[PDB]
């Protein structure tokens, strides 16, 4: 019963899930490695990537990357650093 994809009509994942060769929602590398077919840049922020917002109020690092460290909350933080 696909959620996304090419066997679902185009549709992409809430919460922008990847969605993975077989039309399922995740954020694991079955969903978000080889053969995603969209939103595969869940883990992914900022600048590079269309300005997106990390979810689950991540922080969004100065290299494009989701997370709550001091890496990606503070020097260079592009969004969510508190």
């Given at each position: 019963?696909?959620?996304?994809?090419?066997?679902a009509?185009g549709?992409?994942?809430?919460?922008?899930?990847?969605?993975?060769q077989?039309?399922?929602?995740?954020?694991?590398?079955?969903?978000?490695?080889?053969?995603?077919?969209?939103?595969?840049?869940?883990?992914?922020?900022?600048?590079?990537f269309?300005?997106?917002?990390?979810?689950?109020?991540?922080?969004?690092?100065?290299?494009?990357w989701?997370?709550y460290?001091?890496?990606?909350?503070?020097?260079g933080?592009?969004?969510?650093?508190?």
């Amino acid at each position: 019963a696909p959620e996304c994809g090419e066997r679902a009509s185009g549709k992409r994942c809430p919460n922008g899930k990847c969605c993975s060769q077989w039309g399922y929602c995740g954020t694991t590398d079955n969903y978000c490695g080889q053969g995603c077919q969209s939103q595969c840049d869940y883990w992914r922020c900022g600048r590079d990537f269309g300005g997106r917002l990390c979810e689950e109020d991540m922080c969004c690092s100065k290299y494009g990357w989701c997370g709550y460290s001091d890496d990606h909350c503070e020097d260079g933080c592009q969004s969510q650093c508190d």
